[PDB]
Amino acid sequence: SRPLWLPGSTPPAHLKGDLPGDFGFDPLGLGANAESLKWFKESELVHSRWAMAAVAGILVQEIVRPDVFWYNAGKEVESPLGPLGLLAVEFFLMHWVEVRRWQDLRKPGSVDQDPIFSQYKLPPHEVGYPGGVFAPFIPGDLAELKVKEIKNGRLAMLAFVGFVMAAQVTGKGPIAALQEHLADPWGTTIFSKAAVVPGQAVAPPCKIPASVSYKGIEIPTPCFLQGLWP
Amino acid sequence: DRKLWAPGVVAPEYLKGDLAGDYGWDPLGLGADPTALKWYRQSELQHARWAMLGVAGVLVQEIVKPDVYFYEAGLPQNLPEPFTNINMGGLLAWEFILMHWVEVRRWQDYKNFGSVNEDPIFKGNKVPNPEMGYPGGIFDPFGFSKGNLKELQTKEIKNGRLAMIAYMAFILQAQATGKGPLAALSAHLSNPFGNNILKNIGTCTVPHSVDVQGLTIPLTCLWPGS
Amino acid sequence: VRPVWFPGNPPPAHLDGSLAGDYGFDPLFLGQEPQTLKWYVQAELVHGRFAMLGAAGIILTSIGAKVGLGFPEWYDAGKVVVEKNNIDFPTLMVIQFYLMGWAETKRWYDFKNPGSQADGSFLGFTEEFKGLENGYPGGRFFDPMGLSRGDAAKYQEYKQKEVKNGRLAMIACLGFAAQYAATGKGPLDNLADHLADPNHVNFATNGVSIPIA
Numbered sequence: 312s313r314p315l316w317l318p319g320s321t322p323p324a325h326l327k328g329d330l331p332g333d334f335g336f337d338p339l340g341l342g343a344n345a346e347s348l349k350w351f352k353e354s355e356l357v358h359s360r361w362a363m364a365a366v367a368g369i370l371v372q373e374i375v376r377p378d379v380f381w382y383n384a385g386k387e388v389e390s391p392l393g394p395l396g397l398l399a400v401e402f403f404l405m406h407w408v409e410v411r412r413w414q415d416l417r418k419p420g421s422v423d424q425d426p427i428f429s430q431y432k433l434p435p436h437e438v439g440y441p442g443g444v445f446a447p448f449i450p451g452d453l454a455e456l457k458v459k460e461i462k463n464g465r466l467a468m469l470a471f472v473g474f475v476m477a478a479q480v481t482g483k484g485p486i487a488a489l490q491e492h493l494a495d496p497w498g499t500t501i502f503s504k505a506a507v508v509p510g511q512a513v514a515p516p517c518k519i520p521a522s523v524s525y526k527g528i529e530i531p532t533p534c535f536l537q538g539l540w541p
Numbered sequence: 542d543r544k545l546w547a548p549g550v551v552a553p554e555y556l557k558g559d560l561a562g563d564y565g566w567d568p569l570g571l572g573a574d575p576t577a578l579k580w581y582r583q584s585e586l587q588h589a590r591w592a593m594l595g596v597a598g599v600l601v602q603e604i605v606k607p608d609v610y611f612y613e614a615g616l617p618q619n620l621p622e623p624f625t626n627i628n629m630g631g632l633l634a635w636e637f638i639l640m641h642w643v644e645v646r647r648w649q650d651y652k653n654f655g656s657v658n659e660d661p662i663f664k665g666n667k668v669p670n671p672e673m674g675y676p677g678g679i680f681d682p683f684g685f686s687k688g689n690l691k692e693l694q695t696k697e698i699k700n701g702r703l704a705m706i707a708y709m710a711f712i713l714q715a716q717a718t719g720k721g722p723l724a725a726l727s728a729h730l731s732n733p734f735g736n737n738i739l740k741n742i743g744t745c746t747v748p749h750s751v752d753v754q755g756l757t758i759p760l761t762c763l764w765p766g767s
Numbered sequence: 768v769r770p771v772w773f774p775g776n777p778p779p780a781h782l783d784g785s786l787a788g789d790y791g792f793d794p795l796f797l798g799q800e801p802q803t804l805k806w807y808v809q810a811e812l813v814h815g816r817f818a819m820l821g822a823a824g825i826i827l828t829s830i831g832a833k834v835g836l837g838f839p840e841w842y843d844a845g846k847v848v849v850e851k852n853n854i855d856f857p858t859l860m861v862i863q864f865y866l867m868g869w870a871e872t873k874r875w876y877d878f879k880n881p882g883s884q885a886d887g888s889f890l891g892f893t894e895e896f897k898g899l900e901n902g903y904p905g906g907r908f909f910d911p912m913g914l915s916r917g918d919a920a921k922y923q924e925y926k927q928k929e930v931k932n933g934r935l936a937m938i939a940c941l942g943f944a945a946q947y948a949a950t951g952k953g954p955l956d957n958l959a960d961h962l963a964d965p966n967h968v969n970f971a972t973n974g975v976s977i978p979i980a
């Protein structure tokens with residue numbers, strides 16, 4: 312009765328519409344084991360939230376800074392706090408955060424307390440959905456937003472891969488790729504840039520250098536699946 | 542069902558006249574599976590209806606202009622006035638996605654006959670689908686159905702089967718001599734002994750490749766020989 | 768009743784249809800013992816398991832070559848990587864025997880004792896190396912998606928899809944060597960030659976394949 316990924320079809324037996332965003336799409340059988348479904352239900356939400364923050368990261372950076380290109384912007388920021396002091400903070404400050412999230416996955420009733428401010432405590436929530444501090448002023452129904460998080464999330468995970476594969480083919484940001492498509496739609500598609508006939512394979516070259524210098528030792532910058540491109 | 546494809550032939554047991562155009566045929570056993578007979582019925586309707594557009598394309602594109610040749614009408618130099626030297630990669634991008642919608646909706650009408658009838662965007666008017674392969678409703682803007690439907694359902698195939706053979710004729714009367722169907726009709730009706738099936742079977746007027754904007758094509762005739 | 772390798776002929780008595788990819792093909796009756804056939808079911812998988820890794824490995828490094836990348840061909844990838852990276856060759860192969868001869872005798876005592884290797888004798892891991900059946904260990908490490916449990920009706924389908932891709936991967940890795948010894952070039956160079964002119968650029972026109980050239 313629920314909407315599906317393909318309306319004439321039937322959902323598989325392990326998908327019964329219990330979970331948010333459950334449109335019945337799992338052709339490869341991956342939601343069969345219920346031990347491993349919890350791991351994937353967590354990892355879809357984590358993959359979505361980083362990608363929502365990344366796509367809105369590139370879109371905000373492109374509308375305020377037309378100078379630098381985001382694929383190259385991990386190289387040119389010139390922080391005064393060192394190249395590896397940043398990585399040292401990010402390593403420790405995420406090896407705290409993720410392991411708290413991981414222990415919440417393993418035992419859900421084990422991570423609720425502020426360890427250094429024990430007067431404060433998280434509410435006994437659902438796994439992957441902390442709330443309490445992480446969720447003030449929730450608008451409307453919570454399960455409505457729980458589907459809005461994944462629909463915008465799944466749209467953004469396809470968006471970031473669309474950002475990367477446009478950044479390796481035309482090498483410009485995703486409004487500059489949009490301005491290439493809106494100035495000339497009939498010639499600026501991937502079907503226009505490439506075709507494989509049985510007898511020759513015409514693929515675009517990289518708009519990406521093979522390596523970069525970056526302060527001494529060189530860093531390899533490969534085009535993600537160059538050679539297997541159409 | 543009767544008046545079969547040959548006089549003394551017993552019709553097969555699965556061809557008792559239910560489907561239209563049923564002539565006790567299939568001397569290759571392909572409709573013996575009941576689940577395969579429906580799909581071969583759907584693929585017969587597709588091969589009929591595209592050929593009826595194909596025949597009505599080829600002998601109309603040379604009545605409106607007997608200049609652009611239908612074998613090389615796909616080359617961008619031969620496209621009309623707003624489309625001359627279009628990017629074929631862009632036009633294939635339209636056609637692929639516009640057809641991967643339509644066909645998969647038709648394909649799911651095969652796989653689940655009944656859960657694909659509604660306009661999915663506008664939950665409004667449905668399509669009343671009486672039987673598989675015959676959607677109707679908005680595919681009948683003239684209301685020419687809802688009469689003796691079985692009579693027109695036979696007329697669709699008999700015109701369709703002839704159009705399949707005529708369109709494979711339209712190709713083989715074009716690779717053998719490099720000439721259009723009404724143009725090979727003129728070539729026959731001028732000298733009906735030097736422009737027959739003889740002395741043109743065994744010569745292929747098609748090159749090994751015609752380059753399209755940086756792409757080669759294998760371009761094979763349906764028999765060897767040049 | 769089931770489809771057999773050769774229609775008409777019945778399957779042999781030792782080969783009822785329960786294995787994956789079973790098509791009754793034992794003309795030499797090599798699986799006539801029910802315990803050596805337990806070994807050859809292990810043997811067909813790990814030959815197909817390495818060949819599926821192999822045939823994907825030849826093809827993916829040959830897709831990168833002939834497009835313009837700096838890839839070697841699969842018969843020349845052995846020399847070019849113990850020369851670019853200064854990797855001493857005997858100390859590469861010996862560690863290959865250490866790591867895999869570890870991983871192989873675990874299998875060789877799964878076949879001798881299927882309940883074994885699950886006593887905490889390893890670093891504490893007990894039921895990860897339990898082993899579900901012959902040639903299909905499963906558990907946490909070897910099936911991290913968890914596809915061998917949940918629905919078992921689709922798992923029997925995946926068992927057959929593994930063996931089917933596993934058979935023709937072994938035929939491919941028998942054909943990559945055969946396309947190289949006959950012609951003397953890479954695999955997708957032989958494919959693109961067969962797609963240039965499908966006539967006359969086949970196996971019949973070498974003079975290496977048929978001696979009646």
Ligand code: CLA
Binds near residue numbers: 371450
């Ligand atoms: C549009 C996407 C979207 C939506 C609908 C939701 C919805 C929800 N989230 Mg979620 N979340 C998202 C993105 C989203 N999230 C992202 C990207 C992250 C990573 C930062 C998180 C991290 C997160 C956590 C850690 C938790 C939730 C929780 C919740 C639930 C209650 C909170 C709430 O009312 O949020 C409503 C959300 C909105 C109204 C979206 C407003 C967006 C505005 C327009 C700003 C966006 C643009 C701006 C540039 C973004 C940058 C902000 C910042 C980085 C500078 C609800 C299901 C809580 C939960 O489920 O516990 C019960 C919870 O604990 N989410």
Ligand code: CLA
Binds near residue numbers: 564567570572581705
């Ligand atoms: C691709 C086109 C196509 C397809 C799918 C079908 C399918 C079908 N036809 Mg049909 N038919 C066709 C074209 C086609 N027809 C043409 C062109 C004619 C005119 C000669 C006929 C005349 C005809 C009659 C008279 C009857 C059928 C019947 C049937 C049904 C049962 C036969 C069966 O199971 O075969 C399934 C068929 C296929 C899977 C097609 C396979 C094609 C093979 C592999 C190779 C083709 C041979 C060769 C290349 C043809 C070249 C001809 C040349 C002149 C161009 C089935 C639904 C019977 C019926 O109505 O039952 C309901 C029946 O009585 N057909």
Ligand code: CLA
Binds near residue numbers: 787791804808810937
């Ligand atoms: C790599 C080795 C290998 C091994 C051990 C097996 C093992 C098995 N296969 Mg199998 N198979 C293989 C490769 C292999 N297969 C390949 C490549 C194909 C595709 C052609 C098949 C296709 C196949 C089918 C279709 C069927 C089996 C079946 C079987 C089972 C019973 C037959 C038996 O006792 O095998 C004994 C096998 C050996 C002793 C190893 C073969 C080595 C021989 C002795 C060397 C010579 C082989 C050949 C002539 C040389 C070619 C290369 C040469 C030119 C260099 C058994 C589990 C049957 C079964 O029950 O399915 C599960 C069955 O129906 N196999």
Ligand code: CLA
Binds near residue numbers: 942
């Ligand atoms: C996995 C299947 C496979 C595929 C897709 C190809 C594809 C190709 N091969 Mg190749 N080849 C294969 C397996 C395969 N090969 C094997 C197993 C051998 C060893 C016998 C060879 C030996 C070989 C040579 C010597 C040459 C090619 C060539 C070619 C190319 C041109 C086609 C041709 O000449 O036909 C060759 C086709 C075959 C040899 C047969 C196809 C595979 C059959 C079906 C074997 C399967 C085993 C069978 C079912 C059971 C064996 C029975 C036994 C157990 C008792 C083409 C790209 C030629 C080339 O380089 O082109 C320029 C060429 O010179 N191949």
Ligand SMILES: CC(/C=C/C=C(C)/C=C/[C@@]12O[C@]1(C)C[C@@H](O)CC2(C)C)=C\C=C\C=C(C)\C=C\C=C(C)\C=C\[C@@]12O[C@]1(C)C[C@@H](O)CC2(C)C
Binds near residue numbers: 569571595602611705
């Ligand atoms: C679909 C079709 C053609 C559609 C063509 C189209 C849209 C063409 C469009 C164009 O041309 C125009 C308009 C303009 C051009 O500038 C551009 C193109 C694009 C080129 C032909 C099918 C044509 C299909 C044909 C001819 C199929 C024939 C099959 C037969 C006869 C088989 C019969 C049997 O298999 C059975 C049925 C049962 C067995 O028991 C017995 C045997 C005998 C085996």
Ligand SMILES: CC(/C=C/C=C(C)/C=C/[C@@]12O[C@]1(C)C[C@@H](O)CC2(C)C)=C\C=C\C=C(C)\C=C\C=C(C)\C=C\[C@@]12O[C@]1(C)C[C@@H](O)CC2(C)C
Binds near residue numbers: 817841936
């Ligand atoms: C063909 C084959 C086996 C064929 C056996 C057959 C037909 C036996 C059939 C029978 O027994 C039965 C069934 C039943 C009996 O009654 C009858 C017979 C008839 C006796 C195995 C191939 C098996 C082929 C295998 C396992 C190949 C693996 C290849 C690998 C790992 C390659 C790796 C590399 O290529 C890369 C990836 C990169 C390179 O640069 C480096 C290297 C290392 C070269």
Ligand SMILES: CC1=C[C@H](O)CC(C)(C)[C@H]1/C=C/C(C)=C/C=C/C(C)=C/C=C/C=C(C)/C=C/C=C(C)/C=C/C1=C(C)C[C@H](O)CC1(C)C
Binds near residue numbers: 477
């Ligand atoms: C949690 C919480 C809680 C509390 O309570 C409150 C608060 C605070 C409010 C909250 C928060 C929230 C948030 C932050 C959110 C965010 C979101 C996002 C970011 C989304 C995105 C999302 C995103 C998305 C969808 C995206 C999409 C995108 C897209 C399609 C794109 C496309 C493209 C591409 C490819 C490329 C080309 O060239 C162009 C374009 C066209 C450009």
